[PDB]
Amino acid sequence: DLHLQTGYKVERHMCDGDIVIFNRQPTLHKMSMMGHRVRILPWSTFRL
DNA sequence: TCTGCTGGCCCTCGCTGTCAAAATTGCGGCTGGGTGTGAGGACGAA
Numbered sequence: 001d002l003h004l005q006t007g008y009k010v011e012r013h014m015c016d017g018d019i020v021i022f023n024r025q026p027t028l029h030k031m032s033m034m035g036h037r038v039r040i041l042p043w044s045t046f047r048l
Numbered sequence: 049t050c051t052g053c054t055g056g057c058c059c060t061c062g063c064t065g066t067c068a069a070a071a072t073t074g075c076g077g078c079t080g081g082g083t084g085t086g087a088g089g090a091c092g093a094a
Contacts, residue, residue: 025073
């Protein structure tokens, strides 16, 4: 049942090079939330 | 035919009673979800 014909959708894991967006309350201005690129690093924190 | 005092009507004012709002996000922990009762069931003793 794992055959992939054209037109399907596959929910892959978030690999490196993906685009995400970071936020910190309070968002006072439009610099306070904006996009980044995903780089996969060890340990358990966001590293910006 | 004029002068001019007056109740009424309108408008205005100042004051007071009520109205709604009061940064963003996240995590952890405790406490409380009504209660008493007229009668349905069972029982110990005789």
